[PDB]
Design a protein around this ligand. Structure first.
Ligand SMILES: CC(C)Oc1ccc(CNc2cccc3c(-c4ccc(C#N)nc4)ccnc23)cc1
Ligand SMILES: CC(C)Oc1ccc(CNc2cccc3c(-c4ccc(C#N)nc4)ccnc23)cc1
Lengths: 289, 49, 99, 39, 238, 289, 238, 39
């Protein structure tokens, strides 16, 4: 039954049991149900009024904290002779690059949420003059819009694209992107192929495509070079989640897929996820006095 | 078949049109790829002179 | 607004806005097709629905195509206009398209 | 505090205390009993 | 009483005398798409008993070395009967499934099968950066075999797969498993040739054993689509 | 009929049709009306309760986003020997210089709105010393007012002109200009001549003249030179729009006119706006398996 | 007003601007089989819009020497679309038909087509004692041509064929004919591969004539099954 | 939030959901019908 649960369940006192035909510790795992054996059935209990709150395990609280999704460093310099991110970069938006957020999200099959984005920028002098207070432009370039080819291309005039202009001395730039799947939920996993032909990508729902984040320095280059690093954080909010999954055990290999190899030896080897003990009779950290 | 008499033109034209119906909906505004510029336009610099 | 269905070389200017139909001596022949990809550069792109929709990324809902016959009063004929939901190739024979 | 015009701009919704774990723990068509053996 | 079950759908019936209840995934039952959730506006075809019936796949042999088996839905049924003809002629499909898995042996045999329905079972490849190809994924009626059932071929784990809708076949206890699957998708309908909603997985966590004379011990899979709808009638892709 | 529309229209179920004299798929384009054929008339439909909102295509939302209208770079230096923008510039206000805003506005014949103006300033050291925190003055100089001739001319004392003084380290300077046409709407297009004689300008309504934006650095020059770039953004708000138009296909040539040449070859050549396919029977991206 | 007609069935529509009313055979309209007339007790499949739609056959050329054409129902449709797949998978079928026949020419052309639906059009052979063979009768989508339309290939007469449901196409007057056929059988259902309920016949009683430049003048046949039911699901005969 | 004295200083007015597309789609003096042919 669906019910409102704010605290852990109370324990009732229980007596001795000796009833024929009543056998609450016996179960049948083959049904696929979990054991319904209560502690009051397994042992004699006392009454316990339980006050422990359950708010910290809410899916909202579990997922709605800001995580790094993108980090890029580029040279802020005169690029006339470079081969390179020439005072700007383009990022194809994804959540698979940083394993801590990736593993948390992949505990679920379908997710619906809005994304709070924070952009943190940092600058160092290339191998000192002090640090300049640069202006940056982040521009969202949706599917089928033209991405900028140059720091000063006219794409940056941004007539209809969302842009945010922000300083390095400011607090980190912050915006919310709405839930923008063409379905009612994002497909965290996708057992399918993106195209009507056979050559399309496995494992990525086309319905979930966000677009590109294009970031430039707005200033003309200075006489000396700098490295600029941009960090993007995403925080899910107003979250719905469906069909929880076995967590990732093996190290990730790629952002394109669930391909797996494991560590050379346990823990998280393909052959052994838990580290070995000497025998099933060995207690590894046994208390001895 | 297209069937015409001798004094009609033997070849005829269709014009095709399209519209959205009132169930049509659009989402997520972007810059249109139908227009761009490389240089300044003519007389744009002269607005500063 | 008018589709540029005749987006072919040697159609010049206004000629790209009309499709010419001739009498045929073989039954049930294909006359023309129209690609429906509004994002790519096809007959639908330079239309009112086309040009406005391209400021946006997502779309939903029905489209209406209307064809005006511009032969003489004495011209007669019957055409079949077919929409094929996606999944396979564009049909090349009437017995396939009429499904 | 939310002075933005779109409701998706809002702060997070941490008040949804509804649970139904039985859809994951007991998706059996005939519900289990305490006072009777499962099979 | 929870050990005997009859499932009747269309012209097909299954009886079992040794069930272990049955699973309704997430407590759901299959339903047709309501008007407040519809997208496609053409009137759907609803073939009922022509599609909503058990199809029995080719049986597989349970051997001492078996790693387990899988079949993807709708892919495993996309070429079978009037269900296959409707998927071939229509752009869009929606249905549930009733899955019945069958495996009898003697009272001197032992062994346990995990029978689990996995939503969006996006496979990984082993020890490569290249994603699984089309022919690795799309297997049809034959289905595939597990490469590494211990990570479910996806770098996760078998031990936690009981979070998905499942039963067991424990040869001591029961000879069949039943799982009822609702429609399980983020969209209300889908193109059946390029996305699989469900993977059936059968994994021998305890191997088959006996000391009587050996016999072939097959595992048999019967799947009935439930509440089939199809939209976007055209020629057959086929 | 004028009505309030918030969501796309619902679809009703429809039956088989076989009525003599009723022929809803036939139309007459020569009236100039668009086809009134409904889907329920053309095919058998199901009932669909349609929830899709129409708010993002509101003319307010379509136009009311900030677009670049003016960008100017000048040298901040000792100009005693220069030929040049000598620590200040004057801009004759127009919307025709940046094609993305220009094309959006030109979808309409008449527009009435207020303009939100944002001024973004950036500085680089001329070919490093750090970047100075300069004060700038933007002064609106209406029609027939005197424009400044020098960085320190007395015109900048601004007794009655609107001026804004702003720092480079500040957020971008922001003001609203009211709708200020001497008509009830701006003339986005003008099929006329500005003067009572024949030699006046074609294509510009005199009623729409805004004036000049004059921008100086307020600081005395430093011992070293800098480049300052000023970017002006305009956001229409409180918008009314009348008589929508065929969109621009050919590349713009000039800010003074609608003159057209086209690209050398399709797309957007004068002779061919859509790119060519091989024949009217060729499907360019045909699905093959 | 009786000259313009739109017929809409499923995803298909036909408009005509030059009809001559339309015929409802014997004043009937197609209906599904009621319970008080049913024989077969399995629940029927009723595919609706997947089957109940216009199928357009290959057009035939009207020439000065043409004797006329015929198509048998259900045979001409037994291999077309989801109608054909359901007839192939089911022992029993029932439906009506809506037949639309199309033939335009100029105002300088003349000619008249008798368009007639003949129930149980059991053919004769000419000048032999041997009955017509299977390949003489079963023609599929192509249909056949008349050997002797003056006796309707059955030793009766063309002059009296107006007792059957018919219209005319008189190129002076109209460019299309429409006939609505009920279920017309002594049994409530039939096996569609061995009995044809209806023969469509198109006979040029007045030959095509003009003195303008000749053009090919095709005749086109579109047939929509109406209220399709199928019983006795099994494998496809096909 | 608007503490400015001139009402043109305000934020944008995104609530005007009135449409009349018939002035562009159907400026015909006799309105079209569904149940009758146009000409
Ligand atoms: C420049 C400014 C004005 O616009 C911007 C700024 C930054 C961004 C970057 N956003 C984003 C970065 C990374 C992920 C997302 C997602 C997302 C997350 C998880 C899942 C799952 N499972 N699916 C989708 C949704 C929306 N956004 C995202 C986009 C637009
Ligand atoms: C220095 C401060 C205090 O004052 C300032 C600051 C900046 C400005 C620059 N404004 C402006 C720049 C560009 C355009 C406009 C328009 C305008 C836009 C579109 C159409 C059309 N179609 N028609 C008129 C109206 C008012 N303004 C404008 C003017 C005065």
């Amino acid at each position: 039954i669906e019910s409102i649960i704010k605290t852990a369940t109370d324990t009732v006192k229980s007596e001795i049991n000796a009833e024929l035909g009543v056998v609450p510790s016996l179960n049948a795992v083959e049904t696929g149900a979990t054991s319904n054996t209560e502690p009051e059935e397994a042992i004699q209990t006392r009454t316990v009024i339980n006050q422990h709150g359950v708010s910290e395990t809410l899916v909202e609280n579990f997922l709605s904290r800001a995580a790094l999704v993108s980090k890029r460093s580029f040279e802020y310099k005169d690029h006339t002779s470079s081969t390179a991110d020439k005072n700007f970069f383009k990022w194809t938006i994804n959540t698979r690059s940083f394993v801590q957020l990736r593993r948390k999200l992949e505990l679920f099959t379908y997710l619906r949420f809005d994304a709070e984005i924070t952009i943190l920028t940092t600058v160092a002098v290339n191998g000192y003059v002090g640090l300049p207070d640069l202006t940056l432009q982040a521009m969202f370039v949706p599917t089928g819009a033209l991405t900028p080819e140059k720091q000063d291309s006219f794409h940056w005039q941004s007539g209809s694209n969302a842009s945010v202009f922000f300083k390095i001395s400011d607090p980190p730039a912050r915006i919310t992107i709405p839930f923008m799947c063409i379905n009612s939920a994002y497909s965290v996993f996708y057992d399918g192929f993106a195209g009507f032909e056979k050559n399309g990508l496995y494992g990525i729902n086309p319905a979930d495509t966000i677009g590109n984040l294009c970031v430039r320095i707005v200033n003309e280059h200075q006489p000396v070079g700098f490295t600029v690093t941009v960090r993007v954080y995403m925080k899910p909010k107003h979250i719905k989640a469906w069909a929880p999954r076995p967590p990732r055990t093996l190290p990730y290999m790629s952002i394109a897929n669930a391909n797996y190899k494991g560590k050379e030896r346990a823990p998280n080897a393909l052959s052994a996820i838990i580290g070995n003990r000497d025998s099933v009779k060995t207690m590894p950290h046994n208390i001895v006095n | 078949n297209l069937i015409v008499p001798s004094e009609s033109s033997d070849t005829c034209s269709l014009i095709g049109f399209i519209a959205a119906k009132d169930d049509f909906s659009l989402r997520l505004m972007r810059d249109s790829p139908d227009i761009g510029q490389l240089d300044h336009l003519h007389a744009a610099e002269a607005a500063y002179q | 607004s008018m589709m540029e269905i005749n987006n072919t070389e040697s159609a010049v200017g206004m000629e790209r806005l009309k499709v010419d139909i001739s009498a045929l001596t073989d039954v049930d022949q294909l006359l023309f097709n129209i690609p429906l990809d509004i994002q790519l550069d096809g007959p639908l792109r330079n239309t009112l629905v086309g040009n406005i929709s391209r400021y946006y990324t997502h779309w939903s809902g029905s489209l209406e195509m209307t064809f005006m016959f511009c032969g003489s009063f004495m011209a007669a004929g019957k055409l079949i206009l077919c929409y094929t939901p996606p999944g396979g190739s564009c049909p090349t024979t009437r017995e396939t398209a009429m499904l | 505090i939310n002075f933005y015009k779109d409701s998706y701009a809002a702060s997070a919704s941490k008040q949804d205390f509804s649970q139904d774990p039985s859809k994951f723990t007991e998706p059996v068509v005939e519900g289990l009993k305490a006072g009777a053996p499962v099979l | 009483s929870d050990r005997v079950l009859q499932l009747k759908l269309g012209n097909s019936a299954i009886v079992t005398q040794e069930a272990a209840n049955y699973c309704c995934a997430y407590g759901e039952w299959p339903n047709y798409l309501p008007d407040h959730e519809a997208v496609a506006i053409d009137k759907p075809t609803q073939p009922e008993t022509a599609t909503d019936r058990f199809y029995t796949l080719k049986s597989v042999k349970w051997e001492t070395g078996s790693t387990g088996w899988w079949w993807k839905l709708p892919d495993a049924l996309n070429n079978i009967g009037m269900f296959g003809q409707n998927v071939q002629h229509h752009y869009l499909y929606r249905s549930g499934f009733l899955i019945h898995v069958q495996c009898n042996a003697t009272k001197f045999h032992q062994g346990a099968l995990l029978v689990v329905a996995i939503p969006e079972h996006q496979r990984g490849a082993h020890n490569t950066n290249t994603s699984p190809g089309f022919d690795d994924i799309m297997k049809g009626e034959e289905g595939g075999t597990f490469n590494h059932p211990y990570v479910l071929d996806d770098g996760t784990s078998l031990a936690c797969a009981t979070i998905f809708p499942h039963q067991w076949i424990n040869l001591r206890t029961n000879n069949s498993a039943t799982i009822v699957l609702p429609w399980m998708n983020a969209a209300p309908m889908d193109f059946p040739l390029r996305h699989n909603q469900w993977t059936l997985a059968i994994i021998p966590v305890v191997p088959l054993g006996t000391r009587t004379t050996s016999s072939m011990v097959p595992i048999t899979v019967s799947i009935a689509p439930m509440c089939c709808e199809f939209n976007g009638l055209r020629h057959a892709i086929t």
